[PDB]
Write a protein that binds this ligand. Structure first.
Ligand SMILES: NS(=O)(=O)c1c(F)c(F)c(SCCO)c(F)c1NC1CCCCCCC1
Ligand SMILES: [Zn+2]
Length: 258
């Protein structure tokens, strides 16, 4: 609607329209690495992206999102903390105005320049809209971005952003391989949480990778040239589209490693 990221419509306002914003399993959170307990019962994640079919990229006025065909079992996530199979629906990012900010999760209070979310839904619920109504409906793979060397697998995304500068713009984006956005290691933390944007539904198993990816200053600059506004309204750069850390409450963050 009118929710967004500014002073008058940002995260501190969302609770008026979405009261679960003050719920018991909200995301993101700070990852206290000394308190997260290694769980030797967790499994390696299985990330099977070999058959992914990207379709389109879209400026939705909050972020940009790369969508996939999830009408069968092509790109799927399973294992780790998950039971059953989760299909990849879309990925999007959160980023800052300055490199010292932009991530939603934090690690010992450290903020990363950006955070990538690969959003998957549990096939036992048949469609994403049903899955949003279930505590185990979605699995989101979160990957930190730091600024350093370019990520070559990101360049195709960055090069299309000028064709989707404003809200409501989209572009075919076929043949994109999300495998090129992953770091080497799949070591992760996991905890039960929520969407980080309205409706803030408490339906997500979070899987946050420990190893960040590096992206170049030029790449992240291109994110920051996007607009929150649509073609013809005052220009508002799309930056600082992150929700800060929420109370952990009665949750445990588990580590897959160490
Ligand atoms: N971080 S996240 O996964 O919760 C998320 C955002 F933070 C976003 F800012 C966005 S962009 C605008 C939301 O409509 C997003 F699509 C998602 N993805 C989902 C939320 C919207 C509901 C539709 C389908 C689930 C994906
Ligand atoms: Zn997100």
């Amino acid at each position: 609607h009118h929710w967004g990221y500014g002073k008058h419509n940002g995260p501190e306002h969302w609770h008026k329209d979405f009261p679960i914003a003050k719920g018991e399993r909200q995301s993101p959170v700070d990852i206290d690495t000394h308190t997260a307990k290694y769980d030797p019962s967790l499994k390696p994640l299985s990330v099977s992206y070999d058959q992914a079919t990207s379709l389109r990229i879209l400026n939705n006025g909050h972020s940009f999102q790369v969508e996939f065909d999830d009408s069968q079992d092509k790109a799927v996530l399973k294992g780790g903390p998950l039971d059953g199979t989760y299909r990849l629906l879309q990925f999007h990012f959160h980023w800052g105005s300055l490199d010292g900010q932009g991530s939603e999760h934090t690690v010992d209070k450290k903020k990363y320049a950006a955070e990538l979310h690969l959003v998957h839904w549990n096939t036992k619920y048949g469609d994403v809209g049903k899955a949003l109504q279930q505590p185990d409906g979605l699995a989101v793979l979160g990957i930190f971005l730091k600024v350093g060397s370019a990520k070559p697998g990101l360049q195709k995304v960055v090069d299309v952003l000028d064709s989707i500068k404003t809200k409501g713009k989209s572009a075919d984006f076929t043949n994109f391989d999300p495998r090129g956005l992953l770091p080497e290691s799949l070591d992760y933390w996991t905890y039960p949480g929520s969407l980080t944007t309205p409706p803030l539904a408490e339906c997500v198993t979070w899987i946050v990778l420990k190893e960040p990816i590096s992206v170049s200053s030029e790449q992240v600059l291109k994110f920051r040239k996007l607009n929150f506004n649509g073609e013809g309204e005052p220009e508002e750069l799309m930056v600082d589209n992150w929700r800060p850390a929420q109370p952990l409450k009665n949750r445990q963050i588990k580590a897959s490693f160490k």
